[PDB]
Structure 1
């Protein structure tokens, strides 16, 4: 992996564009105003791509050779890169401060800043805006995931009386759904920050590898059928497969796609009559989690429950919402995203069903269908030293005041009302709102401070 060619091409040409006599280029990152975001993931990109010796004779030469063909000219700054190579044995001469991983900071706040520690590397700061900006992703997943949690929390509480198994309500299916493998990892981790139910094994490694979990492994998973494992017995032997999968895994909790063919038959005939004996005989610690993924998450859950409440002994819980016997539960495989999640869950409430009966699972929406647009994650330059004297820089397009960028040296502070506040123009040095909450996490190619995935949990915690 070469960092020399891991940025947006035109930046390779920025070094010549900054005012002459520029010693410092201070840049920050924020989710311009989902009122609060989970800041998570920077630590990953810092260890995997930024720390250590990132420059090498071979990497400086590879760059030139490419940018030579790419730009049909030698625009590439081999001069400046080669400088970093010798002067600091390839380590990047930049400082990066940030809010502790997992922090839930409201929109408009400085989550992390990047600046060059060596005056000649005034071009490095923004060079890495790209590589570093891709954190918008894990942050977004992390945020959106955590928002879907509150929705399940709000409704589980005002329906069951508590939050048992909350952390296992949104299961990550999106492994096949993501754009790449690496993404599968990163995204899976921005979920395990809010729930422990994940099928995208990848996100786990990353965690143990870049964040470390003292707990017994990050997320988990129960065995489950897929369309191939049931359609393979032939449409006529669907029963044979259902009964083979609940028996093979009579052991632990098993999930079984019941919509291969008429989801409402499988529920009313196969599970509620033929294999009635393999359900009721089950353990509460290992129920048969019926799983449809046919059409319209709301109407199906309701009808599924309706059918099941009818072939099985339903009970009314402390709050009045109907509840299936401990050996029968349901998971919403398809159509679930932060928006529909809200529909289904409230749709159940109106229908008196308890959010207990059902646990959900989102694929693409959960790990894809996310953009740097959603939370307005942006990396803009606010401070710069031109000729020994700094100047507060920022952009303010006319056709868009929403795109005004902060100006000057920034600092994150807790306000007397408990919330946060991002101070600009260096005013954070007036000793006003306590200490800056951002922490130097990166300086001269060496991770100066990291958090464990267990810490990220505690930070991103709800309520």
Structure 2
């Protein structure tokens, strides 16, 4: 990895574009005004990409050679980079101040700021925009996941009177449906801020290496079938597949994909009659989890519950909602995103089924079907020093007021009523508003403040 090759190409040319005699460029990241965002993932970038000796004689040469061909021109700032190598032993003269990871912050507030700490390095502040803005991704995943958790909490509370098991209601199925191995780990770690169930194993090592938990692991799974492990038995032997599988995993939870041929037949006749005897004998700690995987997600879930309720003893909980026996549950893991998840719990509630009965698995909806656009994650220069004079800078495009950026030096504060406010134009120095919530997390090649994954989970808790 070479930081000199980890920027947008045009930024290579920006050192020649700033006003002459500029000693300071100061920039900030916000999710421009999903009303509130979980700030998560910066610590990963700081440690993996930004800290320590990130410049070498070899990396400068490599970059020089690539850019000469990429631009067909000599534009690369070799002197600037060499200056960092010789004076700071290749450590970046940058200070980054950030809100604590896990914090839940309303849109349109500063989340972190970046400035250069040596006047020679005015151009470096925005060199690293590209790499830092990629924080949009863990922010957005953590945020969207938490939003699903609110929906789940609401309906679980209403239909059952408590939140037991909430942490296990939205399982990460996204490993194959993301764009890379690196994304898999990042995105899976962001979902674990809110939940504990994951099949995206890559999340575990990222968390262990960059954040840390008191528990051996941040996330957990159970045995579960796929179509290959059912269909391999042959079309006439789905029942043999089911029987083999539940018997192999008789004393832990086991999920069994039941739609290879006919989900409704599988529920009513295979599980509901042929194999009923192997299900009703199961422990509460070791249920059968039936998994539909096709059809309209709402129609399929409701029809499956209807079938099961006629084949197995249903109770009615203290809230008046129907509850399957504790050895039998359902997981819907097809076509699940925040919208369909809402439609399913609502449809269940309508038909008087407790949310205790259901869990969800989500792949692309959880980890891939998200864009920098969703929270308007944006990094802009708000302050420069030119000829020893600070000036407040911003954009304000005529046709789009939503793209107006903030002016001057920024600070984030608690308001008297307990909300958040971003003070502009260095007004935080007036001290009318208690201390700045941003803390120095990076300074001159060193990570200066870290959060464990346990702290982050606490910071990102739901209200209730």
* 2:369 counterpart residue number: 369
Q: Would you say the 8 A contact 1:233–1:240 is kept in 2?
A: yes
Aligned partners of 2:117 and 2:370: how far apart in 1? 33
Q: Would you say the 8 A contact 1:192–1:218 is kept in 2?
A: yes
Q: How far off its partner does 1:296 sit?
A: 1.3
Map 1:380-419; keep pairs closer than 5 Å. Answer: 380-419=380-419
* 1:122 counterpart residue number: 122
* CA deviation map 1:433-461 (0-9, x unaligned): 10000010000010000100000000001
Map 1:67-86; keep pairs closer than 5 Å. Answer: 67-86=67-86
Q: How far off its partner does 1:162 sit?
A: 0.5
* CA deviation map 1:169-213 (0-9, x unaligned): 000000001000000000000000000001000011000100011
Q: How far off its partner does 1:251 sit?
A: 2.0
Q: Secondary structure at the match of 2:370?
A: coil
Q: Secondary structure at the match of 1:365?
A: helix
Q: Secondary structure at the match of 2:250?
A: coil
Aligned partners of 2:322 and 2:74: how far apart in 1? 71
Q: How far off its partner does 1:335 sit?
A: 1.1
Q: Would you say the 8 A contact 1:179–1:368 is kept in 2?
A: yes
Q: Extract unaligned runs of 5+ from structure 1.
A: none
Aligned partners of 2:100 and 2:309: how far apart in 1? 46
Aligned partners of 2:310 and 2:74: how far apart in 1? 74
Q: How far off its partner does 1:74 sit?
A: 1.1
Aligned partners of 1:107 and 1:199: how far apart in 2? 31
Aligned partners of 1:242 and 1:155: how far apart in 2? 31
Q: Secondary structure at the match of 1:356?
A: helix
Q: How far off its partner does 1:307 sit?
A: 0.4
Aligned partners of 1:439 and 1:339: how far apart in 2? 36
* CA deviation map 1:283-308 (0-9, x unaligned): 10010000011111111110000000
Aligned partners of 1:266 and 1:27: how far apart in 2? 58
Structure 1 residue runs of 4 or more that deviate by more than 3 Å after TM superposition: none
Q: Would you say the 8 A contact 1:172–1:366 is kept in 2?
A: yes
Q: Would you say the 8 A contact 1:215–1:454 is kept in 2?
A: no
Aligned partners of 1:192 and 1:327: how far apart in 2? 26
Q: How far off its partner does 1:29 sit?
A: 0.2
Q: How far off its partner does 1:235 sit?
A: 1.0
Aligned partners of 1:415 and 1:285: how far apart in 2? 46
Q: Secondary structure at the match of 1:176?
A: helix
Aligned partners of 2:67 and 2:233: how far apart in 1? 56
Aligned partners of 2:323 and 2:375: how far apart in 1? 37
* CA deviation map 1:369-406 (0-9, x unaligned): 11100001100110110110011111111110000001
* CA deviation map 1:277-334 (0-9, x unaligned): 1110001001000001111111111000000001000111110110000000000111
2:223 is the alignment partner of 1:212: no
What is the total number of aligned residue pairs between the two structures?
A: 463
* 1:299 counterpart residue number: 299
* CA deviation map 1:225-258 (0-9, x unaligned): 0010001001110001011110000120000100
Q: Secondary structure at the match of 1:190?
A: helix
Aligned partners of 1:231 and 1:104: how far apart in 2? 45
TM-score by length of 1: 1.00
Q: How far off its partner does 1:216 sit?
A: 2.9
* CA deviation map 1:130-159 (0-9, x unaligned): 001000000000000000000000000001
Q: How far off its partner does 1:215 sit?
A: 1.8
Q: How far off its partner does 1:56 sit?
A: 0.4
